[PDB]
From a paper:
P. aeruginosa produces two chemically-distinct siderophores, pyoverdine (PVD) and PCH, with relatively high or low affinities for iron, respectively. We had previously shown that Scn does not appreciably bind to PVD or PCH in qualitative binding assays, and does not arrest the growth of P. aeruginosa in vitro, suggesting that Scn does not efficiently sequester one or both siderophores. The quite large PVD structure would also not be expected to fit within the Scn calyx, nor would the structure of PCH-chelated iron be expected to fit within the key binding pocket, due to tight steric constraints around the iron center imposed by K125 and K134. A preliminary crystal structure of a Scn/PCH complex (3U03.pdb) was deposited in the Protein Databank (PDB,) by a structural genomics consortium. However, examination of this structure revealed a number of concerns. First, using the deposited diffraction data, it was readily apparent that the PCH ligand as modeled sat in negative electron density in difference Fourier syntheses. Second, this particular crystal form of Scn usually contains three molecules in the asymmetric unit, though only two had been modeled in the deposited structure. Using the deposited diffraction data, we re-refined the structure, successfully placing the third Scn molecule and improving refinement statistics: Rfree/Rwork values decreased from 0.303/0.269 (3U03.pdb) to 0.253/0.235. Calyx electron density features in the re-refined structure were inconsistent with bound Fe-PCH but were consistent with a bound sulfate ion comparable to those observed in apo-Scn structures crystallized from ammonium sulfate, and in the phenylurea complex. We concluded that Scn does not bind PCH, at least under these crystallization conditions, in concordance with prior results.
Siderocalin/Lipocalin 2/Neutrophil Gelatinase Associated Lipocalin/24p3 is an innate immune system protein with bacteriostatic activity, acting by tightly binding and sequestering diverse catecholate and mixed-type ferric siderophores from enteric bacteria and mycobacteria. Despite limited sequence similarity beyond minimal fold-defining motifs, lipocalins, including Scn, display a common structural architecture: an eight-stranded antiparallel β-barrel enclosing a cup-shaped ligand binding site, or calyx. The calyx is strongly electropositive overall, due to the close arrangement of the side-chains of two lysines (K125, K134) and an arginine (R81), which complements the net negative charge of many ferric siderophores. Scn displays exceptional structural rigidity, manifested by its near-identical structure across multiple crystal structures, bound to a series of distinct ligands, tolerating multiple mutations.
Numbering used by the authors: 5 to 178
The structure:
Amino acid sequence: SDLIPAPPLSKVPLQQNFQDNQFQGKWYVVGLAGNAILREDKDPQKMYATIYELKEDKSYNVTSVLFRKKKCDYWIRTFVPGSQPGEFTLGNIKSYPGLTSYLVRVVSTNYNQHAMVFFKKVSQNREYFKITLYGRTKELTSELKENFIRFSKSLGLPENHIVFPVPIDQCIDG
């Protein structure tokens, strides 16, 4: 493995006055960028969806659903409130083999249409980061997609590390 290095956290803005209640519900992954994300023209990445449910204790149950091998695949994360509102750590990190580190920062959102979220983790001592462009719908404007490309490039990622998953109906319409 050779990886583009994680950016310093100083280059990753935090959404001011983060509203945890308004960030809840279903988000479509309209854009994906990161040091382990590679464009694949033979088999282009399919859109998946992530559901944020705020618990009584103010941590998030995070359920993601993707269409793989004719079936809906579910995976669950717990996001624990971090240092400042809009940051999170991963609950029960010991239950993920090789994972020593996991950070979430909500970069920007208007809550009812779009969000950009930064993830950083250390797995088998390798440092991974990604940015997801979230949509409340499966389509976003040229403007929001160019904003996400610009932001991804500001963190050192070239074009072939930025993908726009293809909209689908299976699994993610529930």
